[PDB]
């Protein structure tokens, strides 16, 4: 019975960690933060609508300089888009047309962009040539690529829905450290500011605080009730946001390693596809299968404002780095700009 | 006013507009096929037939019409996480093995491969993206089906049939219990056909049940239907 | 790698014809602008022609409009210059220089080895390099000043000014790019500094490879315009 003994071990394991939690829990977010003034009513206006994609948007990413995004559709291309002018810098054909997620690197000279085909294709934009080059493809993952972060030109994290997430070297294109423990499809990923940590949410409805060098699993999470398709660090990187198909965000916090606040109303049964934050962190921002944007005060759960100006479903969503500007892309081939 | 540099900027912006409108329109022009079905259920067969890890992409050309079809066999993840990426096709070619009308399963015990088939065909054929979208039904493997039909009853598998062993009305019963799986009678068309070994009626077969839908789909962009 | 060769030089009678070539491999070329610049032999650079990528957009100097004609063949590669009615001013050696704009881009960054013609026999901006020759020792810093009649720098904050190096005997290389900013294989010694109307660049810890003439050259409007050049020489 050596299976048995180690199943009641882990049982026994879970309630002294449930316990430990619910002895560090001596007030709630909101009886704290009941003092606050709210944020008032946040109406932010379409600056600009990027034309060109003709078919569905599945993701979005800010340079950081914060004029320049790339974004990913299933037409098989990725755009490079000016934002203050609407001028396309670069169009790139994919070879697999079916893209899930893509990344822009921190010094701008790489995008990266995988999907249905298990690959994660990283872009050189900075060629001698004047065009856009595949410069690497990381192959490795037996599942769908979810997501895709880079760490700096050489080092980037993808999650998969072979329920791990990799570390990948990029120069010999090989997959430094492998990150397991979730049962199900990872959805999302997020890096913290410091690059040291990553957290991801899986389809095992539950999210995982990893190190990025010892490889390991620090913290786990739970709460929600099905897929957690989309997670974002706080500012300050003690704190992160999920969004799940139960139509709730939540705002856990690793030091007090659990649930910390939960955003959700009964006018919404859709599920969130994306979150991101203000660059203070007081607003939460999450796309929805309503085909709106909903703007939560991150600091009291009040819904702050609405930003309604897509015809089908907002898939992706991000903040600039000035936190000047929030751009939306969606199933309706546009991206819109909103201030 | 711009200057020298924000219009030739702006040009270049114009001429990969231009670029991508010419792509988008050839992309437009070509026919979209989803694969499904069970896994050893002659998808294989399909493919070798119609071309004369991820997802398997196959082009053809036939009477000047190009077929882009995606074999998504491979793929062992959760399946509503990456299916709305088919919703606009132009249509599902489903395979079926009627040869496993009294195999088991291998991954589960006392589970027949038929009735795998027909919850898989279920899940597909009345899923909230494929409202529209039209089935091509192709039941594979008639010949080993007639073999076994001799020696092996079709009730192991369809304890209420109540006709005989004969080849036919077992097609018939087969092709009738997958065709009353649709719910959606009324939006969506089912199209089966029976393989035929080297014959090619299948990429015919194809070619004219795509036909139908084109067809059916611009008498509702014209109002008319 | 990246290659413009010219062809086509040689000695012409006056009130004639000649058509200059420059074949582009190693680069993406039907995305590139590309212009003609000459050089008259004991003068400076001065701009000739531009034709933008996709060939929608075509510029001449005054001093050859109506008389030259550039074009491109964008499978084949090639740039022409297609002259008529040469006159004595047009001998110079002539030089294809790639251009792309975009975002971020560093135009004018390549440049070909240039051919030679020789011919027997108002509004537009004014760029001043007030000293023509400057003597300097190695490992010595050294400012070179340039001065627009304009205000270079645009509404939209972009400061339109670069600089161009001329070796003896090469053909001049980019070394800055709308005036603060620093070409790719350039060292990071140079520096550029301007206020609108005012420019500097400066070069820490002179090495015997920086000798050579130094342009600047306006491209906030057309015609493109460069300074006279200023030359450092050794001793």
């Known amino acids: 019975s050596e299976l048995d003994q180690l199943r009641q071990e882990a049982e026994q394991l879970k309630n002294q960690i449930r316990d430990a939690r619910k002895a560090c829990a001596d007030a709630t977010l909101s009886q704290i933060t009941n003092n606050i003034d709210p944020v008032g009513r946040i109406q932010m206006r379409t600056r600009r609508t990027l034309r060109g994609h003709l078919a569905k948007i599945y993701a979005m990413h800010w340079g950081t300089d914060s004029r320049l995004l790339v974004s990913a559709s299933q037409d098989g291309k990725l755009i490079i888009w000016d934002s203050y002018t609407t001028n396309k810098v670069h169009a790139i054909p994919l070879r697999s047309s079916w893209v899930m997620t893509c990344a822009y690197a921190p010094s701008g000279n790489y995008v990266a962009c995988g999907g249905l085909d298990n690959i994660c294709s990283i872009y050189n934009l900075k060629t001698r040539e004047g065009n856009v080059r595949v410069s690497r493809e990381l192959a490795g993952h037996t599942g769908y690529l979810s997501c895709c972060r880079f760490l700096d030109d050489n080092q980037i994290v993808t999650s998969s829905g072979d329920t791990t997430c990799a570390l990948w070297d990029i120069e010999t294109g090989q997959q430094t450290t492998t990150f397991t423990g979730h049962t199900g499809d990872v959805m999302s990923l997020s890096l913290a500011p410091d690059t040291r940590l990553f957290v991801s949410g899986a389809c095992d409805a539950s999210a995982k605080l990893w190190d990025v060098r010892e490889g390991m699993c620090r913290q786990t999470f739970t709460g929600h009730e099905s897929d957690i398709n989309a997670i974002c660090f706080f500012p300050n990187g003690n704190a992160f946001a999920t969004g799940s198909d139960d139509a709730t965000c939540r705002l856990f916090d690793l030091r007090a390693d659990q649930e910390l606040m939960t955003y959700s109303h009964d006018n919404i049964i859709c599920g969130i596809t994306s979150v991101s934050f203000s660059k203070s962190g007081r607003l939460l921002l999450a796309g929805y299968d309503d085909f709106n944007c909903n703007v939560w005060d991150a600091l009291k759960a009040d819904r702050a404002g609405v930003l309604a100006g897509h015809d089908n479903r907002v898939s992706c969503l991000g903040v600039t780095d000035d936190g000047m500007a929030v751009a939306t892309g969606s199933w309706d081939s546009f991206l819109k700009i909103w201030n | 006013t711009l200057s020298a540099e924000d219009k030739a900027a702006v040009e270049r912006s114009k001429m990969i507009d231009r670029n991508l409108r010419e792509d988008g329109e050839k992309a437009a022009r070509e026919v979209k096929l989803l694969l499904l079905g069970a896994g050893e259920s002659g998808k294989n067969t399909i493919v070798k037939q119609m071309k004369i890890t991820g997802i398997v992409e196959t082009h053809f050309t036939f009477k000047d019409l190009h077929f882009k079809m995606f074999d998504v066999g491979a793929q062992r993840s959760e399946r509503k996480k990456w299916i709305h990426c088919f919703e606009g096709v132009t249509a599902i070619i489903f395979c079926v093995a009627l040869s496993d009308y009294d195999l088991v399963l291998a991954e589960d015990e006392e589970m027949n491969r038929m009735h795998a088939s027909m919850k898989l065909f279920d899940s597909i054929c009345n899923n909230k993206w494929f409202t529209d979208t039209s089935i091509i039904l192709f039941l594979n493997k008639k010949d080993l089906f007639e073999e076994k039909i001799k020696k092996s009853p079709l009730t192991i598998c369809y304890p209420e049939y109540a006709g005989s062993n004969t080849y036919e009305e077992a097609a018939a019963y087969i092709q009738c219990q997958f065709e009353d799986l649709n719910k959606r009678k009324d939006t969506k068309e089912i199209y089966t056909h029976f393989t035929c070994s080297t014959d090619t009626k299948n990429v015919q077969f194809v070619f004219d049940a795509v036909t139908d839908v084109i067809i059916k789909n611009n008498l509702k962009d014209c109002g008319l239907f | 790698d990246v290659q413009l060769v010219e062809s086509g030089g040689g000695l012409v009678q006056p009130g004639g014809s000649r058509k200059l070539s420059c074949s582009a491999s190693?680069?993406?070329?039907?995305?590139?602008?590309m212009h003609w610049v000459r050089q008259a032999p004991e003068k400076g650079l001065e701009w000739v022609a531009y034709?933008?990528?996709?060939?929608?957009?075509?510029y001449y100097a005054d001093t050859v409009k109506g008389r030259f004609t550039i074009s491109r063949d964008d499978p084949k590669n090639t740039l022409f210059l297609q002259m008529t009615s040469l006159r004595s001013e047009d001998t110079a050696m002539y030089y294809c220089?790639?251009?792309?704009?975009?975002?971020?881009?560093?135009?004018?960054?390549?440049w070909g080895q240039g051919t030679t013609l020789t011919v027997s026999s108002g509004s537009d901006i004014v760029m001043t390099q007030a000293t023509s020759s400057v003597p300097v020792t190695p490992g010595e810093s050294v400012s070179i000043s340039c001065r627009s009649s304009?205000?270079?720098?645009?509404?939209?904050?972009?400061?339109?000014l670069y600089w161009f190096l001329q070796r003896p005997g090469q053909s001049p290389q980019l070394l800055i790019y709308?005036?603060?900013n620093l070409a790719s294989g350039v060292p990071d010694r140079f520096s550029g500094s301007g206020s609108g109307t005012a420019f500097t660049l400066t070069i820490s810890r002179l090495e015997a490879e920086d000798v050579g003439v130094y342009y600047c050259?306006?491209?906030?409007?057309?015609?493109?315009?460069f300074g006279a050049g200023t030359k450092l020489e050794l001793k």
């Open positions: 220089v790639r251009s792309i704009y975009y975002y971020g881009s560093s135009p004018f960054d390549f």
């Open positions: 190693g680069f993406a070329f039907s995305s590139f602008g």
């Open positions: 034709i933008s990528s996709g060939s929608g957009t075509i």
């Open positions: 304009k205000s270079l720098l645009h509404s939209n904050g972009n400061t339109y």
């Open positions: 709308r005036m603060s």
């Open positions: 050259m306006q491209h906030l409007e057309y015609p493109l315009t």
